[PDB]
Amino acid sequence: SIKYIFKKTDTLPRSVIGNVLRTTGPDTTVYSLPGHTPVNPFTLTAVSRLPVPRKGNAGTTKTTLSLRREVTINKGTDQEKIVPMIARIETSVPVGVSQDDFKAMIEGLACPLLLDEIHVNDLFLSGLPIATTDVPDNEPLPPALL
Amino acid sequence: SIKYIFKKTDTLPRSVIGNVLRTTGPDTTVYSLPGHTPVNPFTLTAVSRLPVPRKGNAGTTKTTLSLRREVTINKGTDQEKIVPMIARIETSVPVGVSQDDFKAMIEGLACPLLLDEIHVNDLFLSGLPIATTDVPDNEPLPPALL
Amino acid sequence: SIKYIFKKTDTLPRSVIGNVLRTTGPDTTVYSLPGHTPVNPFTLTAVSRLPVPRKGNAGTTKTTLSLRREVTINKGTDQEKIVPMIARIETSVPVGVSQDDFKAMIEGLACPLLLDEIHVNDLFLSGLPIATTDVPDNEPLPPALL
Amino acid sequence: SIKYIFKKTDTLPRSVIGNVLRTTGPDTTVYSLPGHTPVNPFTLTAVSRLPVPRKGNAGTTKTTLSLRREVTINKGTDQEKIVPMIARIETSVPVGVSQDDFKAMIEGLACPLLLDEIHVNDLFLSGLPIATTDVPDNEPLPPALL
Amino acid sequence: SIKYIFKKTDTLPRSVIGNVLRTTGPDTTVYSLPGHTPVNPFTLTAVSRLPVPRKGNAGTTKTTLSLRREVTINKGTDQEKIVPMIARIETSVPVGVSQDDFKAMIEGLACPLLLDEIHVNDLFLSGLPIATTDVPDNEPLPPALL
Amino acid sequence: SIKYIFKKTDTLPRSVIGNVLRTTGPDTTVYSLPGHTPVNPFTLTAVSRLPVPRKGNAGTTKTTLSLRREVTINKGTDQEKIVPMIARIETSVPVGVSQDDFKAMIEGLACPLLLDEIHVNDLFLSGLPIATTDVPDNEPLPPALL
């Protein structure tokens, strides 16, 4: 039938608080987040590349948001190491696109991020395959995702 | 002071409903989403790459989720064109990473996705810089984002 | 006799409100103004070039402020086209200049901008010569313009 | 957030008074202003170029107003020198433009000219970057600048 | 015995007041200080370079603060010349360093700067060796400088 | 407006006590400070290069004062390391310079050194950008810094 890929959870997203650290390029700015020690850096890098219109073509805007934080893994144990975990949102939107359509697609894309620890460990860390869930035919159809 | 990068909005994520279309490779599976005509395809591709241990180095799990939808732009007008919009989540989690810390980063990353049409058009389509908002010192400090 | 080149009007200038868009170079910064769509861009570009001293010559500071709006022309009619209109202030001030003298020149220069629709359409759009008005010898002498 | 680029000041523009000096060309006329000595010339030059229609392209009207004053620098000191300061308005308006839209741009453009001595010396003479001022969210939204 | 290298003087440091002039690079920003004419410039340049981790090596933060002021020398006399004096603080702090220890070194380093005209002319201009002073064994031992 | 770059703090500088260790060159002398173990050396090196007058040119005196102390970083933890932190004052004063002017500039330069732990960690270790502080227009103007 039709299957849940990602069931929505009532887990609100954490607001993102920070302070601007350094502007690498004109299109690239880097923010330092809380807990950013020099030892264990925590940074959000934002790269927003504006659309250049060629003759007969509208531009296409690219936007990239990367959270990188280098954790001291297995500190207590010897041979403890500092290793970076990274999560990126990358988005290419051509000019003609409608804000309604793309905002709905974004809302859909945000769903796998806001999941419980069980699913998050099974998918993003362990690498286990995604478990499809049959939608109950008895229950109302989920939102169309425009 | 300290600035809101992305203020959290009370906008729940749309659940993601689909059906498995094809399995390109052993690590790559492609799902067809609602509204997927062959002319105007709309699909979630999922690429989960397991960690490969290296001598002296633990593996790192990579995970990539791409939504791609090819919209017809300005149909009524001349130069109607089918053009693809894409929104990707890409995540590299080294092995030793803790599920707690990484779910914290994920919850933070989901915040810019669930924004109002004004901010979303200003950032993802128009290409403006991020709208920063001074945190009221009087108001309580926002969540630390672990 | 002596003629009004531009009679002053009690028309206050609109304050200029915007948000910084991109910093092209170290001396060049580009602001996005209200109503800036990707389709119909609307921007203030500011280029402030510092004085470089020469052997035996003081420097001269150059300053350039350009408002560029690409407006859709004859939308309802066939052959509608997005065409740019531009208004620039360009100013070269040598170092030895007194702020008094130069603000006098500026106050003078501002006068033709703040005129009624009739004169503005006759001069800036139709291209007519400047409408000179004989100063009434009976009336007080206008400000000297330092 | 949204920033004042140039806050409007209640500083009326000086009316511009003069007398026609010479007509260099059919489109170019040069006015002599008060204080124009032969030693220290002071002139407004006006160049209004009519639109030339092109095959498939409407014309565009160009208009250029330049105030040039050659001031004596450091008279009391040795090496006193007559050096020119210039302030130009340059405006290109395509034919299809509405006088409403364009007078909006003009009113905006006039704002930085009518500023206090502190900002004028910081920007036009010293060469500092534009002083941006956060708009109070509490206060009313400034005029849209059409 | 043990010698005073630099005896502390009860001379408070002048607070540093300025205004941002230009941002040369992403790590380099230049401030114009009071008395900065283009002919006789006086500026604080600040270059803060982040630590770059190396495989097996923690980063090191470098920080450089340079005051440069070009004085007119012997103006009344012949061979009047504009010549620059420069005073720099340069600091390389590896990542693991403790703020306590480094603030101790800083406080110590500030001591030779805040000296009387006699010692300052003897050391920084004339070029004599450091004036060493035997610490009175009777008097209490000076602070350890951590 | 005008901004505090470094607000003066009522933190007196630590007097510098030491003992002469070795004279490397005629212009170079090296002092051993307290806590200088052979394991963890602590030294002030002073290099005062005298001015050589060329015909028609007064000399320029260079003076360099470097505190270097090699800390055992993260001693408790395994792979503890000895790493050197360094803070230098470097000063080039041409002959014609006035002791008054240069002593005022030195007093200014000493200000960022005598700051609180928060600012010192934010600037010298973390590498965060300098936070400019608006000077209260109501409050008296800070010292000019000659």
B92, B62 contact by CB (below 8 A): yes
- Chain C: nearest CA to D102, how far in angstroms? 8
- The C-alpha atoms of residue C66 and residue C37 are separated, in whole angstroms, by 18
Spatial contact of F49 and F42, defined as CB atoms under 8 Å apart: no
- CB-CB contact of B111 with A16 (8 Å): yes
Q: State the DSSP string of F9-55.
A: -S-PPPPEEEEEEE--SSSEEEEEPTT--SSS-EEEEEEEEPPPPPT
Q: Which of B106, B127, B141 sits opposite A61 (nearest CB)?
A: B127
What's C9's DSSP letter? -
The alpha carbon of residue B146 is apart from the nearest alpha carbon of chain A, in Å, by: 8
Residue B49, class by beta-carbon neighbours within 10 Å (0-12 exposed, 13-18 middle, 19+ buried)? middle
Shortest Cα distance from C27 to chain E (angstroms)?
8
Alpha-carbon span C62 to B116, nearest angstrom: 42
**In terms of CA atoms, which chain C residue is nearest residue A52?**
C38
How far, CA to CA in Å, does A100 sit from each of B76, B118, D102? 18, 11, 31
Determine the Cα–Cα distance for residues D26 and F95; give it in Å rounded to an integer. 62
**A23, A27, A95 ranked by CB distance to C38: nearest:** A95
- For residue E108, CA distances in Å to D135, E115, F101 come to 44, 13, 23
CB-based burial of residue B129 (10 Å sphere; 0-12 exposed, 13-18 middle, 19+ buried)?
Answer: middle
Phi, psi of E135 (to 5 degrees): -70, 130
d(CA A108, CA E3): 72
Residues 31-70 of A with CB under 8 A from C: 50-51, 58-59, 61
> What is the rounded distance in angstroms from the CA atom of residue E10 to the CA atom of residue F107?
12
F128 close to A (CB below 8 A): yes
DSSP one-letter code for B139: S
In three-state secondary structure terms, A119 is: helix
Bridge partners (DSSP) of residue F44 are F31, F67
The region that residue A120 occupies, defined by phi over 0 for left and psi between -120 and 50 for alpha, beta otherwise, is alpha
| Chain A contact probe: residue of C19, C22, C27, C82 with most A CBs at under 10 A | C22
Rounded (to 5) percent helix, strand, coil in chain B: 15, 40, 50
Residues of D in contact with E30 (CB under 8 A): none
Residue E101, sorted as left (phi over 0), alpha (psi -120 to 50) or beta, turns out to be: alpha
- Torsion angle, alpha carbons of D14, D16, D17, D19, to 10: 160
Q: At residue C109, what are phi and psi to the nearest 5 degrees?
A: -60, -30
**Half-sphere exposure for A94 (CA within 13 Å, toward CB):** 17
Question: What is the structure's resolution, reported in angstroms to one decimal?
Answer: 4.0
Rounded to 5 degrees, φ, ψ at C13 are -75, 140
Q: Inter-chain contact E51–A39, Cβ cutoff 8 Å?
A: no
CA-based R_g, chain B, Å: 19
Task: Name chain D's partners: 3 or more CB pairs within 8 A.
Answer: B, C, E
Check if the beta carbon of residue B137 is closer than 8 Å to that of residue A9. no
Give DSSP secondary structure letters for D60-75. Answer: EEEEEEEEEEEEEESS
Residue A48, C-beta contacts closer than 8 angstroms, at least 6 positions apart: A27, A61, A62, A63, A64, B123, B127, B128, B129
Q: Do B126 and C20 touch (CB under 8 A)?
A: no
E2–F111 C-beta distance less than 8 A:
no
CB atoms within 10 A of CB B138: 5
Distance CA E105, CA F44 (A): 10
Tokens at residue C35, please? Answer: 């109503």
Question: How far E81 CA lies from chain C's nearest CA (Å)?
Answer: 12
Nearest-by-CA chain C residue for A48: C22
| Alpha-carbon gap: B133 to the closest alpha carbon of chain D (Å) | 6
Cβ–Cβ of C59/E38 closer than 8 Å?
A: yes
How would you classify the pairing of strands A16-22 and B3-6? antiparallel
Question: Which DSSP letter does residue D113 get?
Answer: G
CA distance D37 to A47: 56
